[PDB]
Amino acid sequence: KGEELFTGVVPILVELDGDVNGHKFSVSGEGEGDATYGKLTLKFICTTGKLPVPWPTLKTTLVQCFARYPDHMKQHDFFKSAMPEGYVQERTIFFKDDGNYKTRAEVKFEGDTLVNRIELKGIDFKEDGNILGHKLEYNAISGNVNITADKQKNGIKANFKIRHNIEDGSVQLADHYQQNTPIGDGPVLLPDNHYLSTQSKQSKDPNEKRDHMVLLEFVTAAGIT
Ligand SMILES: [Ca+2]
Ligand SMILES: [Ca+2]
Ligand code: NA
Structure with missing residues (x-):
C-alpha cells in the first residue's frame, strides 16, 4: 500500500531545528520527489x-x-x-x-x-x-x-x-550509523541486505541572498541481482 503513494511527483517539506556546540539554527526546505526515477529536487534556506x-x-x-x-x-x-x-x-x-x-x-x-x-x-x-x-x-x-x-x-x-x-584537497570523513522504526502498526517490508547508490550535486540560486542550498539527488537501490 505505501509504494502506491510514490507513483507520481510528490511535494516535499523539510523542517530542521539544530544546536551544534550551542549554535542554534533552523532550516526550511521545499521541493519534489519522483521515486519512479529515484529523483529529488530541493531548495533549503537557513531561516x-x-x-x-x-x-x-x-x-x-x-x-x-x-x-x-x-x-x-x-x-x-x-x-x-x-x-x-x-x-x-x-x-x-x-x-x-x-x-x-x-x-x-x-x-x-x-x-x-x-x-x-x-x-x-x-x-x-x-x-x-x-x-x-x-x-x-x-x-x-x-x-x-x-x-x-x-x-x-x-x-x-x-x-x-x-x-x-576540504578546501586544501583533503577529506573530512563523516561515518554514519542509522536506525529506522515505523511510526504506525501496518506491516512493513523487512529487507535482505542491500544498498542505496546515492549521489547529489549542490548549487546556488543566483537570485537568492539568504543562506541556502539547492540540491539535485538521485537514489537507486542495488546489490540484489
Ligand atoms: Ca581536489
Ligand atoms: Ca556551505
Ligand atoms: Na515517481
Whole structure:
C-alpha cells in the first residue's frame, strides 16, 4: 500500500531545528520527489540567518522513501512500506578528528506532502576544525547506504561513509550509523541486505541572498541481482 503513494511527483517539506556546540539554527526546505526515477529536487534556506555549519554536513540529514527500487527488489523497500504513517529515522554522524551529530527525524505524509521533521544535536566540535571553521568545499556528495533488517524493532539499520572535500584537497570523513522504526502498526517490508547508490550535486540560486542550498539527488537501490 505505501509504494502506491510514490507513483507520481510528490511535494516535499523539510523542517530542521539544530544546536551544534550551542549554535542554534533552523532550516526550511521545499521541493519534489519522483521515486519512479529515484529523483529529488530541493531548495533549503537557513531561516535563522547564517548557517553556523557547512551546508554539506547537513545534506544526509535533510527522505530515502524517494529511492528507486528496481521491480525485482520492491519487496525490500522498508521506507515506502511504512507510509503514510511514516518512520522515525535516527543517526549518529561521527566527523573524524571532530564532533558528532545526533539526529532524530519523523518522515510521514501530511495530506499529499511528504514531510521530514528533524531535530539535530552536535557536540564536541573544534572551533577551528573543518565544520565550525567552514573549511569544506560545496560541490557533490555520493556513497552507498548499506541496509540490514532490524527485526527486534520491526525496522532497518544502515551504515555508510561520506567523504566531504576540504578546501586544501583533503577529506573530512563523516561515518554514519542509522536506525529506522515505523511510526504506525501496518506491516512493513523487512529487507535482505542491500544498498542505496546515492549521489547529489549542490548549487546556488543566483537570485537568492539568504543562506541556502539547492540540491539535485538521485537514489537507486542495488546489490540484489
Ligand atoms: Ca556551505
Ligand atoms: Ca581536489
Ligand atoms: Na515517481
